[PDB]
Design a protein around this ligand. Structure first.
Ligand SMILES: NC(=O)c1ccc[n+]([C@@H]2O[C@H](COP(=O)([O-])OP(=O)(O)OC[C@H]3O[C@@H](n4cnc5c(N)ncnc54)[C@H](OP(=O)(O)O)[C@@H]3O)[C@@H](O)[C@H]2O)c1
Ligand SMILES: COc1cc(Cc2cnc(N)nc2N)c2c(c1OC)O[C@@H](C1CC1)C=C2
Length: 157
């Protein structure tokens, strides 16, 4: 498959100053579970955010920098190289990847954070006319997980 994996808030904020606007361990665990043993594609900025590869999956970074060579990372330099990777590919971030990818992907694993954050980056506006709710599951709250959130899985109609 080719999937978006994203958390965005009630106004489609994904990002502030090159970080998540929220502490939400449960969603990062969601990320682990979904993506372990699989492939992530991310833009250069998001990779700098994470700061190195995530273990136990394939890590692929899209970048115009031809001198990019990072232990444990496969570089690519066009959107088109994505379509050639084997297996289940998660589009991992960030804003620009989602923009370039969102009409191309089979489905999306969105976490909706039921808050309003300050952001400087956003998820593309989308319509539920275009997208079927394969599943919607309320995130569980504790002290360590204190924002309401819902895990959507959408498939292109
Ligand atoms: N909420 C979430 O689920 C989530 C997940 C990840 C990231 N984020 C957020 O997203 C924001 C980052 O988004 P962003 O748009 O600024 O950055 P980004 O998408 O992570 O990275 C963009 C970079 O990717 C490379 N790139 C993108 N398209 C390319 C193409 N077609 N050909 C060659 N290279 C290409 C370029 O790198 P070069 O300049 O090196 O060429 C470009 O500057 C941050 O705020 C971060 O916190 C949110
Ligand atoms: C933009 O920053 C991040 C994006 C992301 C990507 C990300 C996060 N959350 C969701 N729902 N989708 C995503 N694509 C992550 C992330 C980020 O901060 C390091 O943390 C890591 C944990 C520490 C290893 C995991 C994911």
């Amino acid at each position: 498959t080719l999937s978006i994996l994203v958390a965005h808030d009630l106004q489609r904020v994904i990002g502030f100053e090159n970080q998540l606007p929220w502490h939400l361990p449960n969603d990062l665990k969601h990320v682990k579970k979904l993506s372990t043993g699989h492939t992530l594609v991310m833009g250069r900025k998001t990779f700098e955010s994470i700061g190195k590869p995530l273990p136990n999956r394939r890590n692929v970074v899209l970048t115009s920098d031809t001198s990019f060579n990072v232990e444990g990372v496969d570089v690519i330099h066009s959107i088109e190289d994505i379509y050639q990777l084997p297996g289940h590919v998660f589009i991992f971030g960030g804003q620009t990847l989602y923009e370039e990818m969102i009409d191309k992907v089979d489905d999306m694993y969105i976490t909706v954070i039921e808050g309003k954050f300050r952001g400087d980056t956003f998820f593309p506006p989308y319509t539920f006319e275009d997208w079927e709710v394969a599943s919607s599951v309320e995130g569980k709250l504790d002290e360590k997980n204190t924002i309401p959130h819902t895990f959507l899985h959408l498939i292109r109609k």
